[PDB]
Design a protein around this ligand. Sequence first.
Ligand SMILES: Cc1cc2nc3c(=O)[nH]c(=O)nc-3n(C[C@H](O)[C@H](O)[C@H](O)COP(=O)(O)OP(=O)(O)OC[C@H]3O[C@@H](n4cnc5c(N)ncnc54)[C@H](O)[C@@H]3O)c2cc1C
Ligand SMILES: Cc1cc2nc3c(=O)[nH]c(=O)nc-3n(C[C@H](O)[C@H](O)[C@H](O)COP(=O)(O)OP(=O)(O)OC[C@H]3O[C@@H](n4cnc5c(N)ncnc54)[C@H](O)[C@@H]3O)c2cc1C
Ligand SMILES: NC(=O)c1ccc[n+]([C@@H]2O[C@H](COP(=O)([O-])OP(=O)(O)OC[C@H]3O[C@@H](n4cnc5c(N)ncnc54)[C@H](OP(=O)(O)O)[C@@H]3O)[C@@H](O)[C@H]2O)c1
Ligand SMILES: NC(=O)c1ccc[n+]([C@@H]2O[C@H](COP(=O)([O-])OP(=O)(O)OC[C@H]3O[C@@H](n4cnc5c(N)ncnc54)[C@H](OP(=O)(O)O)[C@@H]3O)[C@@H](O)[C@H]2O)c1
Lengths: 310, 310
Amino acid sequence: MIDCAIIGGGPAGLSAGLYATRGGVKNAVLFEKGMPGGQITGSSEIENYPGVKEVVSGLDFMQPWQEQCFRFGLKHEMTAVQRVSKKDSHFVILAEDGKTFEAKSVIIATGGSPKRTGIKGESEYWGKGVSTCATCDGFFYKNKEVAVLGGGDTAVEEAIYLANICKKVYLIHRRDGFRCAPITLEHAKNNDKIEFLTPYVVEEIKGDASGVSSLSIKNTATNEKRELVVPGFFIFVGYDVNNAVLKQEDNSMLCKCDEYGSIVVDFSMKTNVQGLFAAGDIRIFAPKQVVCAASDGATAALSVISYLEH
Amino acid sequence: MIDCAIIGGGPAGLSAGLYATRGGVKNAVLFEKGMPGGQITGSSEIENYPGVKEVVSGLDFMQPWQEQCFRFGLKHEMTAVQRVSKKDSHFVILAEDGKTFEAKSVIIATGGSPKRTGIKGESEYWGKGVSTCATCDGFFYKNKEVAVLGGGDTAVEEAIYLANICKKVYLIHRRDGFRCAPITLEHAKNNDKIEFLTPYVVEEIKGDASGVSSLSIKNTATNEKRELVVPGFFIFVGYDVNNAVLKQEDNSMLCKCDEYGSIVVDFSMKTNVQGLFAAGDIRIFAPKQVVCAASDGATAALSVISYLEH
Ligand SMILES: Cc1cc2nc3c(=O)[nH]c(=O)nc-3n(C[C@H](O)[C@H](O)[C@H](O)COP(=O)(O)OP(=O)(O)OC[C@H]3O[C@@H](n4cnc5c(N)ncnc54)[C@H](O)[C@@H]3O)c2cc1C
Ligand SMILES: Cc1cc2nc3c(=O)[nH]c(=O)nc-3n(C[C@H](O)[C@H](O)[C@H](O)COP(=O)(O)OP(=O)(O)OC[C@H]3O[C@@H](n4cnc5c(N)ncnc54)[C@H](O)[C@@H]3O)c2cc1C
Ligand SMILES: NC(=O)c1ccc[n+]([C@@H]2O[C@H](COP(=O)([O-])OP(=O)(O)OC[C@H]3O[C@@H](n4cnc5c(N)ncnc54)[C@H](OP(=O)(O)O)[C@@H]3O)[C@@H](O)[C@H]2O)c1
Ligand SMILES: NC(=O)c1ccc[n+]([C@@H]2O[C@H](COP(=O)([O-])OP(=O)(O)OC[C@H]3O[C@@H](n4cnc5c(N)ncnc54)[C@H](OP(=O)(O)O)[C@@H]3O)[C@@H](O)[C@H]2O)c1
């Protein structure tokens, strides 16, 4: 049977595969729904991966990871994992196609995905100024005006953050009431560089050949229209954790998760289940950066190696 | 004063500076003795940094980090830090050149130092067949024979690890008795791929342009001498974290450490002191890999950015 089944082929899974195989795990299999690379492949530019000086698309950035991470014997399974279950002292991995695989250890590296809106222009201008990552794209908007969409803790927190780099932030939300904490809302209300626009919806994300130039926004109450001229639009309308593979037949979870469905791990990337590790955006307190996911993968693989020895 | 003082210019501090400055921290200063790059610059070959496909020396690997991590206004302070103290709501950084710097936040990224033996040849072949990292360099000796030096938990655990990758491991120690846990000794003693050489000292590490080629050893009980022909020599005679900057004039420590002196951090790289963070090999449970240190630095910088907001 498989020594280590790595579920998900983004940076976490790829790094775990590199480390596991280069560390002497002879039968490691990377399960991935499509082409690996993960979320970054949807980005037009990455420039903050330490040690990679060239600015290139997310797709181009991930291209060399394929040869490198497979250089030491990693195997691929191009399949959609439906479930991971514990059976005695091993794991049973059910694929969506009906196939079952057995593994001694498992690394869950399935990531997650920022939620999208379907606002007109969102796809066309995705990655030219429509962003779902202030850390990735905030720096370009230094001394400029930006808009943030959402009314949760993430929206309001990233609004406060962008308020420290940008000239002005327009915080757009469809209700007068906010889901975020009162304390953080208070901070945002006291920040003079944040203009609250509520209750508003964004009807169109407008741009050039190049990209985002303005937002066509509407006051849902008065129907008054306004064009917000901003080259940066940050969307924070929630985040989907890809934890579906943890759900058992009886609806229980394979391992402990937090209230949001993120996998609880320790500093060794161990879950509360022997032989089961997690890595990347799927785990608690993930910073949501490629280098952080890659580090998790390496850590989880190192733990797998020790586990398989013992 | 400085918004964030980063203490150490290895991958953790460099990644911290990149993220801090790209995240809008206006006055971030990296303190480093000599030139950034850290421990990996002692290695003749790194190939396990995810996303960097080329096989190059540590020095060459780190060279692109200089321009990249300083691209966004990071400042460089070319001096060793003697001490970090907390004073009211800030930090006082006493440098060895006698200057004092004030900072609103600090990231400790000072790493650590494998203990060296001073054996003839050690300096010359360091990183060229002499290694203190089995995960780093073990794969090169797959199906070959290697030697391990030491008698503690690290040496014996790494001998067991290497015996799963290499053809044979010679475990060399200067006494018949070992400091490692009893069960670890038992496993090693009964592993057919480990040959114990005790009580022995290594008199010389010999080699050529290609690297290590043999060890001259001596049996201190019987005084007889032997040449071990091995291309790989792993040294595990202890390790010291670089926590000297935490030591206060009154002999207290700036922040909580574990029993070995590694800085306690949470998943956000926060210490028990407000405004003080730590990253890389200095912190508890550090896996001791470049990617892991870089991730810690990124994480600490994001925590710094949040901290400086309020
Ligand atoms: C648009 C965008 C821009 C970004 N910009 C940056 C940036 O500039 N810098 C940076 O550091 N980070 C950036 N990020 C964040 C970074 O991409 C993520 O933090 C990182 O990809 C997380 O890696 P991961 O391996 O944990 O998960 P993911 O990248 O989400 O990879 C998970 C993989 O598992 C696969 N999978 C999931 N479920 C299954 C299943 N059941 N069976 C089989 N396969 C499955 C998925 O197909 C996916 O390929 C960006 C993210 C996005 C979306
Ligand atoms: C022989 C060898 C081979 C290795 N091979 C690999 C490998 O193949 N792959 C891999 O991923 N990892 C490898 N590593 C491990 C890797 O080098 C470390 O894990 C990593 O460099 C840790 O980064 P860091 O920034 O935490 O610490 P360090 O790299 O130790 O950097 C800390 C920096 O802070 C500076 N500093 C310390 N004290 C002060 C002070 N008081 N004031 C100012 N500056 C200070 C130090 O001089 C140093 O430059 C190897 C290590 C060794 C020894
Ligand atoms: N450090 C912290 O304390 C911290 C930080 C970040 C996140 N969190 C946690 O994570 C959760 C927060 O999630 P998070 O903000 O990503 O999202 P989350 O709370 O779901 O909030 C999503 C927000 O986006 C709005 N929204 C959703 N879909 C939209 C759409 N299609 N168009 C326009 N607006 C839309 C929602 O509006 P409505 O309100 O009208 O439904 C809501 O205001 C909370 O439980 C919080 O505890 C905590
Ligand atoms: N899984 C675990 O629980 C685990 C794993 C690793 C480490 N640890 C702990 O971490 C700490 C560090 O231990 P670690 O083994 O790195 O080192 P540590 O116990 O100091 O052991 C060092 C070993 O190196 C030998 N040595 C020192 N200098 C030498 C020299 N110049 N030439 C030849 N031999 C030399 C010592 O010999 P002598 O014995 O003759 O002095 C000793 O056997 C220990 O407390 C250890 O138990 C725990």
